[PDB]
């Protein structure tokens, strides 16, 4: 409603770097808010794409940002009569970024890995990896829970059970308030998908450079399965956390599986032991239900609600025809121990191929009326197809069915404006939560400042 679309702030990265593919707000040890920006195609040392991360100080004028430096060199360790190998070429460092406390977690989902032993090998595969930084101190650490040293022949004998070689850990990411990093790995267990969790403090204390393969004893991984419903489900394409079991001491995980059960798609709510508490099934095959998940209490009852995006949903129209527009589903959490029922509200896109629901950002309480609000992205929507972000306000019964405000992309065609979103943080300290919008196709980030309601 009250985001300012006149005076924006623009941050920009190098051409072709996909600057803005992922972003988050970052507060330093003094509470000063900055913007961490992932640029997964930034050039490295060998003039090759490896990705990169930028930490943008808040300025009304925006501009260029300094780099958050990470080691981009391939590593090799000859240990235990084996050869361990990391390959960072085209790893996509910055394909996801998230901030917690004064720590930044930037992940390279397509970092490859291999283990040689005489003439055998583990196979060169994208296990993925995440890089952790404490910018104020310069501390660095890594986390790559899907690296293994099992040779390829063994996986074939055991029918590729517990095969984490293609995890792409860090494809999605989230950090609990207690500081537990949760990684989505949609390629884990031969493309079933898995989740990897470990405390940030233990990642730092257990990591040493050059080891490549080390134990994080406090880590916890989800489980493989033989049920074909999960095969090729990309469980962990998207991840989020919240409180859904009524026990404030436990933190529940929200996991998107957009190709679950032969591309029907699903979203699941689990406890921290990966035991399933609820499952939301997709409405329409190939709609990619679960592409994005958001957790926020929208109706002001204190109970977290669930928003699921299906950006490829095809709406029914006249003369038995379908139109791909995308759809967002709102599930209100019921009072006490009860199952999440049918959706409380369906928001459906308008522009053909606009992909409404590709990203869903909690905004906090934007207009300061006591109800939290959301922004939904349609990165190829709007009458021109350049992209739109739509604000929906909370209310006592959930969300308004019509948007309070629509943000048209200020970038050219193909910018993918809205592909990444982040809100609920007051970056200019004016008492109103603001919105940052990534447009990786234009290698830029737009900052929308919230203003007093008019």
């Amino acid at each position, epitope marked *: 409603l009250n985001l300012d679309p006149v005076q924006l702030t623009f941050y920009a990265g190098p051409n072709g770097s996909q600057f803005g593919f992922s972003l988050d707000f970052h507060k330093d040890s003094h509470g000063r808010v900055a913007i961490v920006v992932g640029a997964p195609r930034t050039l490295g040392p060998s003039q090759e794409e490896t990705g990169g991360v930028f930490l943008c100080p808040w300025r009304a004028e925006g501009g260029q940002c300094p780099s958050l430096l990470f080691d981009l060199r391939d590593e090799t*360790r*000859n*240990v*235990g*009569s084996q050869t361990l190998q990391t390959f960072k070429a085209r790893q996509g460092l910055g394909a996801s970024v998230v901030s917690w406390s004064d720590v930044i977690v930037a992940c390279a989902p397509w970092q490859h890995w291999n283990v040689l032993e005489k003439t055998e090998e583990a196979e060169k595969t994208p296990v993925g990896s995440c890089f952790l930084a404490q910018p104020e101190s310069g501390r660095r650490a890594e986390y790559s829970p899907c690296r293994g*040293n099992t040779l390829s022949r*063994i996986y074939v004998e055991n029918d590729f059970s517990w095969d984490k070689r293609y995890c792409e850990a860090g494809f999605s990411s989230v950090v609990t308030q207690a500081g537990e990093l949760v990684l989505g790995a949609p390629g884990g267990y031969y493309f079933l998908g898995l989740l990897a969790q470990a405390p940030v403090a233990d990642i730092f204390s*257990s*990591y*040493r450079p*050059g*080891i490549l*393969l*080390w*134990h994080v*004893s406090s880590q916890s991984l989800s489980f493989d399965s033989s049920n074909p419903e999960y095969f090729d489900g990309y469980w962990g394409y998207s991840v989020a956390v919240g409180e859904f079991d009524g026990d404030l001491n436990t933190t529940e995980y929200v996991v998107g599986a957009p190709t679950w059960s032969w591309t029907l798609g699903a979203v699941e709510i689990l406890d921290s032991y990966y035991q399933r508490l609820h499952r939301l099934r997709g409405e329409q095959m190939a709609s990619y239900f679960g592409h994005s998940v958001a957790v926020t209490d929208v109706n002001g009852d204190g109970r977290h609600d669930l928003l699921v995006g299906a950006p490829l949903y095809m709406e029914s129209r006249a003369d038995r025809k379908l139109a791909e527009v995308g759809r967002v589903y709102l599930f209100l959490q019921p009072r006490g121990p009860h199952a999440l029922g049918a959706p409380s509200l369906l928001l459906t896109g308008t522009q053909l191929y606009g992909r409404f629901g590709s990203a869903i950002a909690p905004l906090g309480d934007l207009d300061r009326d006591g109800y939290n609000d959301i922004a939904v992205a349609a990165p190829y929507g709007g009458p021109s197809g350049r992209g739109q972000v739509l604000v929906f306000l909370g209310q006592s019964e959930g969300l308004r069915s019509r948007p309070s405000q629509v943000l048209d992309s200020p970038f050219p065609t193909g910018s993918a404006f809205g592909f990444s979103l982040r809100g609920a943080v007051d970056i200019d300290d004016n008492g109103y939560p603001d919105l940052i919008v990534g447009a990786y196709g234009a290698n830029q980030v737009a900052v929308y400042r919230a203003q007093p309601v008019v």
Partner: antibody, heavy 119, light 108 residues
């Protein structure tokens, strides 16, 4: 806290067999590699082999191929070292070892099991 | 197998001294070396892994260094508890092999 609690001292005869145990305390035995090391006052320290209790795969020094048999039971959280066709030279102290962080390291050690082979 | 020649076999030193134990391999092992301590009539405690990294709980007066095939364990300002046996172990190749050992003894 990580602790490796081994079985008590064994007193056996030559030609017989013995099976030592190494129980994990404060952690899951399935987490890391578990090695077995032999110590004698003259010959010093010698590496017998290792086991991954998650799957049972083992590696051995070719010197101990035949006498040493390493196994593990994730249920009882225990790893074992079986010695067969015992000889006076098998009289030694045996330690079970696991790493701290590095997959291939040798950081945590049990208190050791004393073995004496005699008629 | 990789031969681990550890030197010296023993040394007579006093409290507060800065001593250094060395370990030479028969081939390069690229810091894939650990250092161990065995107090008199007791089990083993890990000191160093991967050449330089202190095991959790080990005092900072211990330190490891070296590269290629030559490594060292150094103890700055010896404590009364530091008088014990010390061994190096390589894990660059299976089978793992240990150094001969080094016994720190009280000088008088």
């Amino acid at each position: 806290e990580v602790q490796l609690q081994q079985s008590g001292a064994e007193l056996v005869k030559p030609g017989a067999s013995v099976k030592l145990s190494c129980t994990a305390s404060g952690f899951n035995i399935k987490d890391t590699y578990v090695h077995w090391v032999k110590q004698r006052p003259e010959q010093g320290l010698e590496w017998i082999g290792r086991i991954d209790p998650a799957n049972g795969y083992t590696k051995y020094d070719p010197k101990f191929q035949g006498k040493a048999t390493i196994t593990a039971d994730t249920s009882s959280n225990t790893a074992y070292l079986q010695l067969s066709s015992l000889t006076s030279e098998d009289t030694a102290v045996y330690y079970c070892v696991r790493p701290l962080y590095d997959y291939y390291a040798m950081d945590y050690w049990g208190q050791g099991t004393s073995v004496t082979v005699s008629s | 197998d990789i031969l681990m020649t550890q030197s010296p076999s023993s040394m007579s030193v006093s409290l507060g001294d800065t001593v250094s134990i060395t370990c030479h391999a028969s081939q390069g092992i690229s810091s894939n070396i650990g250092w161990l301590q065995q107090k008199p009539g007791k089990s083993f405690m890990g000191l160093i892994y991967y050449g330089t990294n202190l095991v959790d709980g080990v005092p900072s007066r211990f330190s490891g260094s070296g590269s290629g095939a030559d490594y060292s364990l150094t103890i700055s300002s010896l404590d009364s508890e530091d008088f014990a046996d010390y061994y190096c172990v390589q894990y660059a190749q299976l089978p793992y092999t240990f150094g001969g050992g080094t016994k720190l003894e009280i000088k008088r």
